[PDB]
Amino acid sequence: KVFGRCELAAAMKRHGLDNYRGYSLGNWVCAAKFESNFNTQATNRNTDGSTDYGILQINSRWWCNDGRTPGSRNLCNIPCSALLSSDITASVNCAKKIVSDGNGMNAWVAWRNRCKGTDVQAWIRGCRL
């Protein structure tokens, strides 16, 4: 399903992402906007054969199992399909592991290229949170 901007901000906050590892809610909303356009069902195949899943485009190379990414891991211990649910719990929980991995939100290349350093608070502006 496709979240509204404020609807996703609220859901992310409810699931504990606001200021998680020091990243304000606007960072998370901005990342989701450019990764998936707020669509939980978003998938994209990578050149190496791995696939990115869900609102935060989490990659099967490391984080989830899709049964078709040779040599990969499943560090979030979930089927990649869980990342496509209308319920964002699995995506949020896995994102918390990813952002704790060492490079912070730079793990999301779209965040680094389109969100990092910008006025990310604009993404939650006007939202009842």
Curated annotation (Swiss-Prot):
Pfam families: Lys
Annotated ranges, domain C-type lysozyme: 1-129
Active site: 35, 52
Cellular localisation: Secreted
GO BP of this protein: cell wall macromolecule catabolic process; defense response to bacterium; defense response to Gram-negative bacterium; defense response to Gram-positive bacterium; killing of cells of another organism
Single GO MF annotation: lysozyme activity
Annotated catalysed reactions: Hydrolysis of (1->4)-beta-linkages between N-acetylmuramic acid and N-acetyl-D-glucosamine residues in a peptidoglycan and between N-acetyl-D-glucosamine residues in chitodextrins
Parts of the chain that traverse the membrane: none
Residues that, per the record, bind substrate: 101
Keywords: Allergen, Antimicrobial, Bacteriolytic enzyme, Disulfide bond, Glycosidase, Hydrolase, Secreted, Signal
Enzyme nomenclature, EC number: 3.2.1.17
Leftover remarks: Lysozyme C is capable of both hydrolysis and transglycosylation; it also shows a slight esterase activity. It acts rapidly on both peptide-substituted and unsubstituted peptidoglycan, and slowly on chitin oligosaccharides.
Subunit structure: Monomer.
The protein's name in its UniProt record: Lysozyme C
Upper lineage: Eukaryota, Metazoa, Chordata, Craniata, Vertebrata
Gene encoding the protein: LYZ
